[PDB]
């Protein structure tokens, strides 16, 4: 019922040429069930929304919640769509703990990128501090409660869980564990939302994602596609794309 969705967050990497190495193999056997979403950096939203097929999407990595202002390095959702795209990641676990974006700001951005017109892919996840706390549904909830109340359309919603206690730290997040905090997630907004929106709402997996483990990964039950770092910057990635394929 849910479209498979899968995202490729390129991250701080790219140029030209590599973006059109990445565009090169993207024209290859794409299911034609999953929807596509490629996040590249913020000075390449214009170059890749015109050189990439119009079948994939094209998601800024991150915006601001205005218009405009006096934001020194910081782009509008009226920018982004200016270029041309469609999407942007907002709250990625590296704004939250490298750069400090606090749960408010991530909803006013969320709130903001959807009054101007774009879908947005908000991201939540704990650390393994909270983890092996036993907190893990505290603040996965907890972050979602934090945006609820700025997601003014659903339907342009897809959110992205990071097992952020297994990034980074050497930690295996196995699929019956990314499985039951997407299950939970998906009963929360039952109970908090409506279970029109839990049914109908896209929730991927931005843990480690590669060809590799991606069919372990696609069918769990309440995993509706990816969010995927590294492995988008290679032909893999067609792979992944074609997890339930």
């Not at 990595?61 to 934001?71: D, P």
């Amino acid at each position: 019922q849910r479209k498979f969705f899968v995202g490729g967050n390129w991250k701080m990497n790219g140029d030209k040429a590599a973006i059109d190495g990445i565009i090169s193999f993207m024209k290859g056997p794409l299911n034609a069930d999953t929807e596509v979403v490629v996040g590249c950096p913020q000075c390449y939203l214009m170059y890749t929304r015109e050189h990439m097929p119009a079948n994939i999407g094209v998601a800024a990595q991150n915006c601001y919640k205005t218009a405009k202002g006096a934001f020194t390095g910081e782009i509008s959702p009226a920018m982004i769509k200016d270029c041309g795209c469609e999407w942007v990641i907002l709250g990625h676990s590296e704004r939250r703990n490298v750069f400090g974006e606090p749960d408010q700001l991530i909803s006013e951005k969320v709130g903001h990128a959807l009054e101007a017109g774009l879908k947005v892919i908000p991201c939540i996840g704990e650390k393994l501090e909270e983890r092996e706390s036993n907190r893990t549904e505290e603040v996965v909830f907890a972050q979602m409660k934090a945006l609820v109340p700025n997601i003014s359309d659903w339907s342009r919603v897809v959110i992205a869980y990071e097992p952020v206690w297994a990034i980074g730290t050497g930690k295996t997040a196995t699929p019956e564990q990314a499985q039951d905090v997407h299950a939970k997630l998906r009963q929360w907004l039952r109970d908090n939302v409506s279970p029109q929106v839990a049914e109908s709402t896209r929730i991927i997996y931005g843990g480690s994602v590669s060809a590799g483990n991606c069919k372990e990964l696609a069918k769990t039950g309440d995993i509706d596609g990816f969010l995927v770092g590294g492995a988008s910057l290679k032909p893999d990635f067609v792979t992944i794309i074609n997890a339930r394929a």
